[PDB]
Amino acid sequence: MNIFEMLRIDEGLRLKIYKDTEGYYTIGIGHLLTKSPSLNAAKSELDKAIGRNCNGVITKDEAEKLFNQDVDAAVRGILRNAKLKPVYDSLDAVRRCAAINMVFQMGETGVAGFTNSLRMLQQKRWDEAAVNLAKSRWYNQTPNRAKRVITTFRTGTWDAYK
Ligand SMILES: c1ccc(CCSc2cnn[nH]2)cc1
């Protein structure tokens, strides 16, 4: 298991524009296109991302390329973030995957709400961090995925994905 396999499980693969759990236009392996309600706006974003006129449909190769770019962007965002980088660097490799998973799903705009969770993770207080992480809109709205990510932080194993 690695971050790509983990997120492929959590996000699935769809080759035509779909809506994510929040109702936003998405494609591929969880690639957000736009928060606008306009399907045309989503189609423009798709064509820009792929570099051709797609008509809302991509190939598996294209979905996997977008996915690699999106995982890399999440990692680089962590490494550029003064609050996230020290916590990330304190983690083992399996727990780093859980961190990337969260940033892939939620970005960085809500990092400050996770200040206490981040402190508990850096302190390696795994059970306490798991309890704190579940006190979130994230957990309530996507509980099965959040439970898998939280179990990964709690145990440092891939047990939730096996
Ligand atoms: C290290 C780095 C990141 C994380 C999850 C990020 S805390 C957050 C970021 N964006 N939304 N919530 C955990 C340990």
UniProtKB/TrEMBL annotation:
Gene3D superfamilies: 1.10.530.40. GO terms for molecular function: lysozyme activity. InterPro entries: Endolysin_T4_type, Glyco_hydro_24, Lysozyme-like_dom_sf, Lysozyme_dom_sf, Phage_lysozyme-like, T4-type_lysozyme. It holds the Pfam family Phage_lysozyme. Keywords: Antimicrobial, Bacteriolytic enzyme, Cytolysis, Glycosidase, Host cell lysis by virus, Host cytoplasm, Hydrolase, Viral release from host cell. Its main location: host cell. The active site is at E11, D20. The keyword Hydrolase applies. Its EC number is 3.2.1.17. It catalyses: Hydrolysis of (1->4)-beta-linkages between N-acetylmuramic acid and N-acetyl-D-glucosamine residues in a peptidoglycan and between N-acetyl-D-glucosamine residues in chitodextrins. It is found in: Host cytoplasm. Endolysin with lysozyme activity that degrades host peptidoglycans and participates with the holin and spanin proteins in the sequential events which lead to the programmed host cell lysis releasing the mature viral particles. Once the holin has permeabilized the host cell membrane, the endolysin can reach the periplasm and break down the peptidoglycan layer. HAMAP family: ENDOLYSIN_T4. Belongs to the glycosyl hydrolase 24 family. This is Endolysin.
